[PDB]
Each structure stands twice: as C-alpha cells, then as structure tokens.
C-alpha cells in the first residue's frame, strides 16, 4: 500500500539503463543548446522546434525528479544536499524553459527583470548538472 509501488518505481529508477539514458539525455540537452545557439537567423518555426525539444527534455527531468522524490519519500530524499541541489537545478531550469518556450506572453505578470541573465543562468545550470555526476 504505497511503499510497495514506491518500491517498483525505484526498481526502475535505480537501474543502470535508466541511470545512463538519463545521463545521455543530459548530453543531448546541452548539444541541442549549442546547435540552437549556433544557427544564424533561424525562423520562428525553426526556433519553435528547438524550443520544443528543450521543453520535451526539461519535462522528462521533471518527472524523473518527481519519482526520486516519490521513490524514497519526501522526508528522506530532501536531507541529502547533493540531491536537493540537483532537484532545485532541475526546477529552476524548467521554469525558465517553460516561460521561454510556452508562457512568454505571461512573463510580465511575474514582474521578473533580468530575463537575459536568467536564461544564461539556466543554460549554465545544465552544465553544472554534470559537475554533480562527476563525483557520483
């Protein structure tokens, strides 16, 4: 009753195949970003496509996170800094990406300033992600 499924999810989440394919998605996400930043004068149609692919990935990491929080339970997952870090990072990156790609008409209602720097911040956090993996 709960702790059971919370066990099957980990029996998948833990696995090397999903530990690695999630690592492969991180490289993919960065590669994407480089291409996106290197193509001169791409149309809005093309931009929507690269924005779509960044959001797709960002959403995946959001689910992965919502299970590693569900698979060890909130209380237990929260304690490890090397995990809360990674999760915070995932969220921040997702919020930036969601507004960039989907909710931009409504960005003024956040009252946020320094949009350009928040975007740059979010791109760097995707690289910082691997700087946690490197210790493992």
């Amino acid at each position, epitope marked *: 009753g709960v702790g059971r499924v919370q066990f099957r999810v980990r029996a998948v989440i833990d696995h090397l195949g999903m530990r690695v394919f999630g690592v492969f998605l991180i490289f993919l996400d960065i590669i994407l970003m480089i291409i996106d930043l290197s193509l001169p004068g791409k149309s809005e149609s093309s931009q929507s496509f690269y924005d779509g692919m960044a959001l797709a990935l960002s959403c995946y990491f959001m689910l992965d996170l919502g299970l590693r929080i569900f698979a060890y339970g909130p209380k237990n997952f929260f304690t490890n800094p090397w995990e809360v870090a990674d999760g915070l990072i995932i969220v921040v990156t997702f919020v930036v990406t969601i507004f960039y790609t989907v909710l*931009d*008409e409504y*960005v*003024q*209602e956040t*009252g*946020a*300033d*320094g*949009l*350009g*720097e*928040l975007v740059v911040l979010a791109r760097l956090l995707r690289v910082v992600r691997l700087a946690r993996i490197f210790y493992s």
Partner: antibody
Amino acid sequence: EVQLVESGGGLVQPGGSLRLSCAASGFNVSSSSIHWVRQAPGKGLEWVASISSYYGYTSYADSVKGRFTISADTSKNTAYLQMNSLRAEDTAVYYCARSYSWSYAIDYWGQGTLVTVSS
Amino acid sequence: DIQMTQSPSSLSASVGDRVTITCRASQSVSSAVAWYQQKPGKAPKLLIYSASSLYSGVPSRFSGSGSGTDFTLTISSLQPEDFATYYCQQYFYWPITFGQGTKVEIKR
C-alpha cells in the same frame, strides 16, 4: 544615495577627441552596468555604449563603433567614454546611466554633459 | 535594430483624463520594455520596467501593459506635473532602442 556625475563635455573640432567621465556614488561600477545614451538637440534618445565589468563585457552602437571606447576604473568607481574622430552628427547631450546588470532596465540617469562638434 | 514604433507623437489632455501611449516592437522582446519620462532640460526617469512593473516611488497613476509586441503606457489620472516627453525602450536585444517619444501637453 545613488549618484552619477558626468564631466568632460565641451566644444571640439571635427576630427578631434574628447574624454567624458562619470563618477559613481551609491553602488559599485564593478558589479553593475554603465551606459552612455545621447540626445541630439530637439531629438530622441540613442544608446551609445555599455560596460558590464563583471563579465569583461562592453558593447557599442554601430554609429560609434571604432571611434568610441567605454571603460571603467573600479577603484575610482568611475566610468569613461573616450571619443575620437568626432563628427558634426556626434553633437548631443551625453548621459551616463546605470542598470543592475546588462539584462536589467536602466534605472538611474545622470544630468548629462553637452558635446558640441564644430569648427 | 528592433524598431519601437510609438504613437501618438504628441497629445493634449485635461487634468484627471486617462491618457494612453502605445509602442509596437518590430518583433517579440518578451517583457523587456521600459518606460521613461523626460521633463525639459532634465535627464529621463524610469517609470515602468518589465513592461508592467511600477518602479519604486513612482505614482500609481502610471501603469504599463502589454499584449504580444504591443506595449501601452497609461496615465490614468493626468496631473499637471505630467507634462513631459515619454519614451518606450526595448532592452531585450542589442542595440537597446527607443521609440521616438510622445510629447504630453496639459490642457487648461
């Protein structure tokens, strides 16, 4: 307590040179963005240049690229606009201004200094 | 080279009137638009940043809104000290660009 006091404006001959300076109080030039914006008499506002020292980052309008150079002395908390090969069309009030950083709105402007390019 | 097309170029309104100034960006700039008020012989002052956030200490009579690439400064209760030139500005792309300004005259 935020202040921007600019000086160095004046009459200069076409081809001549001028150096404006902007003394900053109330914040660090080293971690903020400084801007120069100009206004020809009876006209609108034209962004000229920016420095965000924290990123080693300066930027220029094409209308002044190669002739103007913006910089900062973090120890004097002062910014500078070196202006060479001046032309008639460069005549304007030059304002120094600041934002929290490069992607933030300019939030304070000094009262500016008048530059007159004429023989 | 983002063009900010600002209209009207000038207007005249009574004390207490609602005044609207429109800026259209040539392409999307998110919410990176600021509004400035410049009184004669003075340097500009920031009124609104991020399209719709009121800058600290500015009277609430000034508000900014946007819809897509269309930006509006509204002065909802014109005061006689509001005589000025108002400029929109985008700061999302380099170079930062300004609209041509709107000269506001108080009708008495």
